[PDB]
């Protein structure tokens, strides 16, 4: 349900949280699922997915 | 292991993956963890984080 951060964490885009160390957060159920950093096998580029956009093979 | 698109994604961001439904998509284990979309209690920003920067309270 709540979660404590551990460390600082600096946002590197638009769309990510900054956030320091003892900060108390709550994560957010979505459409989109957890995201996971994925390789395309099809084209070759890398980067972050939604999980509930996939399934395994 | 591998996964397959079940649905076209175009990215919104520089670190998203845009990706066609059929494509098949490898995941890469990090260090980051999976990313939530998280609302913190402590600021009242919200946006993704690193799931393993983070505990349960």
Known sequence: MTFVA???YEARTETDL???KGE???IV???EGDW?????L???RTGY???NY???S
Chains 1, 2 share one sequence.
Request: proline share 8%; glycine share 4%; no cysteine.
């Open 29 to 31: 159920n979505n459409t």
């Open 42 to 44: 099809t084209t070759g």
């Open 6 to 8: 551990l460390y600082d």
């Open 54 to 56: 996939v399934a395994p």
């Open 24 to 26: 108390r957060l709550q």
């Open 36 to 40: 996971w950093l994925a390789h395309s």
């Open 49 to 51: 997915i939604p999980s």
């Open 18 to 20: 900054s956030f320091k």
